[PDB]
Each structure stands twice: as structure tokens, then as C-alpha cells.
Amino acid sequence: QQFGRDIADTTDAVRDPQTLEILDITPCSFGGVSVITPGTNTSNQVAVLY
């Protein structure tokens, strides 16, 4: 078994040469951002959401 497989049929493991390490494929992903602001007639201050 050189590489594993997940439900979504994507690569999640690999057999690196000379080390035989696990080396899971793509653990890290993106992150979401949202903006909270009041009406333009009051002010223009904003807040950042995750």
C-alpha cells in the first residue's frame, strides 16, 4: 500500500522514498472571512470574522 484513500477519492497519503514516512497529503486548507459593517449613513467602520 503505497498511498491511502479517503471517502472523497482524494490523495491523503504517500510513500516517500528513502524515509518510508507517512506524510499525509493536504491536511491544511483555506479559511473563511466575513465583513460586518453598519450602514453608510452612520459610519464606515468594519469588523473581520472567521
Binding site: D6, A8, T10, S29, G32
Partner: peptide
């Protein structure tokens, strides 16, 4: 939570995000 509420809670059991309820 109520004991009935607790029983009901116990009975109920990659590019995707789930919005938490408000």
C-alpha cells in the same frame, strides 16, 4: 435540560463548511 430533553438529545445521533446555528 429536562430529562425528556436529555433523552431526546441522547436518542438523536475537504471543501465543505457548516454554519453553526444562531
Amino acid at each position: 435540560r429536562s430529562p425528556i430533553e436529555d433523552l431526546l438529545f441522547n436518542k438523536v445521533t475537504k471543501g465543505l463548511t457548516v454554519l453553526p446555528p444562531l
